[PDB]
UniProtKB/Swiss-Prot annotation, chain B:
Homodimer. Heterodimer of an alpha (TPM1, TPM3 or TPM4) and a beta (TPM2) chain. Interacts with HRG (via the HRR domain); the interaction contributes to the antiangiogenic properties of the histidine/proline-rich region (HRR) of HRG. Interacts (via N-terminus) with LMOD2 (via N-terminus) and TMOD1 (via N-terminus). Binds to actin filaments in muscle and non-muscle cells. Plays a central role, in association with the troponin complex, in the calcium dependent regulation of vertebrate striated muscle contraction. Smooth muscle contraction is regulated by interaction with caldesmon. In non-muscle cells is implicated in stabilizing cytoskeleton actin filaments. The lineage of its organism: Eukaryota, Metazoa, Chordata, Craniata, Vertebrata. It is linked to Cardiomyopathy, familial hypertrophic, 3: A hereditary heart disorder characterized by ventricular hypertrophy, which is usually asymmetric and often involves the interventricular septum. The symptoms include dyspnea, syncope, collapse, palpitations, and chest pain. They can be readily provoked by exercise. The disorder has inter- and intrafamilial variability ranging from benign to malignant forms with high risk of cardiac failure and sudden cardiac death. Cardiomyopathy, dilated, 1Y: A disorder characterized by ventricular dilation and impaired systolic function, resulting in congestive heart failure and arrhythmia. Patients are at risk of premature death. It comes from the Eukaryota. The chain holds residues 176 to 230 of 284 of the full protein. The molecule is in a coiled coil structure that is formed by 2 polypeptide chains. The sequence exhibits a prominent seven-residues periodicity. It is found in: Cytoplasm, Cytoskeleton. Detected in primary breast cancer tissues but undetectable in normal breast tissues in Sudanese patients. Isoform 1 is expressed in adult and fetal skeletal muscle and cardiac tissues, with higher expression levels in the cardiac tissues. Isoform 10 is expressed in adult and fetal cardiac tissues, but not in skeletal muscle. Belongs to the tropomyosin family. It comes from Homo sapiens (Human). The modification Phosphoserine is found at S11, S31. This is Tropomyosin alpha-1 chain.
Length: 55, 55
């Protein structure tokens, strides 16, 4: 019961951690894409700053 | 940029105003120079006549 409960607690934990893993991984890809977008919008506006600044 | 451009416009505007003020004083200078020269020419005509009458 303790090794099985353990296995089930761990399976539950493993699943919580697996979901958090996948959730954080999917959300990481999105956070990275937001960083790409955040850097992208930064570049669009910063580039405008440079263009406007160049002008 | 609006200010840099404003300054381009303001300094260009003003330099254009100065071109007009400059042409105005240049033309007034030319007029006064021509006038002063017409007088210097009259002074010379008189000087020639002064020399003629003095002699």
């Amino acid at each position: 019961d303790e090794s099985e409960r353990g296995m089930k607690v761990i399976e539950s934990r493993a699943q919580k951690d697996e979901e958090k893993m996948e959730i954080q991984e999917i959300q990481l890809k999105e956070a990275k894409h937001i960083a790409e977008d955040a850097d992208r919008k930064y570049e669009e506006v910063a580039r405008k700053l440079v263009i406007i600044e160049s002008d | 940029l609006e200010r840099a451009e404003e300054r381009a416009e303001l300094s260009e505007g003003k330099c254009a105003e100065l071109e007009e003020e400059l042409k105005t004083v240049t033309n007034n200078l030319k007029s006064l120079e021509a006038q002063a020269e017409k007088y210097s020419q009259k002074e010379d005509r008189y000087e020639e006549e002064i020399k003629v009458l003095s002699d």
